[PDB]
Design a protein around this nucleic acid. Structure first.
Ligand code: CA
Ligand code: MG
Ligand code: MG
Length: 430
DNA sequence: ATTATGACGCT
DNA sequence: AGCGTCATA
């Protein structure tokens, strides 16, 4: 009843760049613009592995993780841009720097949480209050929401896409109560107006387009964002949740795409998020633990409390390289050469980070994989990170791992290593 | 032989 | 601490 919380206390958005690495390359090389194209890393093995795909290329069935040689079978005219290689390895600097461009623009509108290289959550609650004041009871024009979809509309008593969008938008705005400064639906709508503005600024100042979700929490915002891509934004209201979830596979919700989601489906014998409402909170906690159970009980009702954390910078800086199949490292000289290559890239990024962001990493984590282990990581050991010096870091990394060498011979390494990873962590102010 | 990342949970 | 899960380009 009147004491039942409804998770409508915040306005949260999730902004996510469209085919991000592709846009970065298309900005740089106008010949790639408005083409089926993809970004690939390496080239020798099957033409390289695809890591990003333009929407034009997606239409041919080209996807992430496809080998370029195979993508070309689906899309013969597919254009490719290659990730830079430095020190024998893929170097992602260009995309990290482009990400900083976008994050800095977003930060002008609101506090953001960097969620990945190309997405951020935004807490718009305060910005919406402010805007509502300027608005002075004044209605919101559809003109202010030129790329917004309202999930669930139109409904009730045209055959084109933009026409449908506008019909739904009209129904939404027609039903809005603008004299109520605490109406959650109104708050969301003003949130969407601001996100249009944010998205316009990103595109004007970088050339990059993005999509966005606006709702009352991060999970719904994230879900909303993916509903209409590319170059569009979607508002998911509290009221839209029961219908939206009634046919929403559990795996589509953030954090349920893996083993836990599979267990929810298996144990409960359900398929869709909305089906969760029929279980008590204790029932869910009994299956999935106290934390997950409470989370599931609220989430299937559209409610979630995880805050947008004030964090624009990554918490770790790492460098890693796989050495698959035949290329596995089998000599000490090999292992040491590559630890050095990694350590040199890490030093470069750490030094730039110290200058830009006034902080220093204090721990170095070293991880490897050995030929034969199904797990991505085989062994992870940390040591002190006291100086930004590549030779020192690589010498230290070798020290902490050198006893993983089964080989009775000093010069030989066995079993061969199929992955090396150096990660700087535990930052302190400087 | 997707690879190169990055955040957070468990014990 | 070291390991596991889930996620994104
Ligand atoms: Ca994206
Ligand atoms: Mg993304
Ligand atoms: Mg993606």
């Amino acid at each position: 009843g009147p004491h039942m919380a409804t998770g409508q206390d915040r306005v949260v958005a999730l902004v996510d760049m469209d085919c991000f690495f592709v846009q970065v390359e298309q900005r740089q090389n106008p010949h790639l613009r408005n083409k089926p194209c993809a970004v690939v890393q390496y080239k020798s093995w099957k033409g390289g592995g695809i890591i990003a795909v333009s929407y034009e290329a997606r239409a041919f069935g080209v996807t992430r993780s496809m080998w370029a040689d195979d993508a070309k079978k689906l899309c013969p005219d597919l254009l490719l841009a290659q990730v830079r290689e430095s020190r024998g390895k893929a170097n992602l600097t260009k995309y990290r720097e482009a990400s900083v461009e976008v994050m800095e623009i977003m930060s002008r509108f609101a506090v953001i949480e960097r969620a990945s290289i190309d997405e951020a959550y935004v807490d718009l609650t305060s910005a919406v209050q402010e805007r509502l004041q300027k608005l002075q009871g004044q209605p919101i024009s559809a003109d202010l929401l030129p790329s917004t979809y309202i999930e669930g509309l139109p409904q009730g008593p045209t055959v084109q896409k933009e026409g449908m969008r506008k019909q739904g938008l009209f129904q939404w705005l027609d039903s809005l109560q603008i004299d109520n400064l605490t109406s959650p639906d109104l708050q969301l709508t003003v949130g969407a107006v601001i996100v249009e503005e944010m998205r316009a600024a990103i595109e004007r100042e970088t050339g990059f387009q993005c999509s966005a979700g606006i709702s009352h929490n991060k999970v719904l915002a994230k879900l909303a964002c993916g509903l209409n891509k590319p170059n569009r934004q979607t508002l998911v209201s509290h009221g839209s949740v029961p219908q939206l979830f009634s046919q929403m596979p559990i795996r589509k919700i953030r954090s349920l795409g893996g083993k836990l989601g599979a267990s929810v489906i298996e144990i409960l014998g359900i398929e869709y998020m909305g089906e969760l409402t029929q279980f008590t909170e204790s029932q869910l906690q009994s299956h999935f633990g106290e934390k997950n159970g409470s989370w599931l009980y609220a989430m299937c009702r559209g409610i979630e409390h995880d805050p947008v954390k004030p964090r624009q910078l990554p918490k770790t800086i790492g460098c890693s390289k796989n050495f698959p199949g035949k290329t596995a490292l089998a000599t000490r000289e090999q292992v040491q050469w590559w630890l050095l290559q990694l350590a040199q890239e890490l030093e470069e990024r750490l030094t730039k980070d110290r200058n830009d962001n006034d902080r220093v990493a204090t721990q170095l984590v070293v991880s490897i994989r050995v030929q034969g282990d199904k797990r991505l990581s085989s062994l992870r050991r940390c040591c002190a990170l006291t100086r930004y010096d590549a030779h020192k870091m690589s010498h230290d990394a070798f020290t902490v791992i050198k006893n993983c060498n089964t080989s009775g011979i000093q010069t030989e390494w066995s079993p061969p290593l199929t992955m090396l990873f150096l990660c700087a962590t535990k930052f302190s102010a400087s």
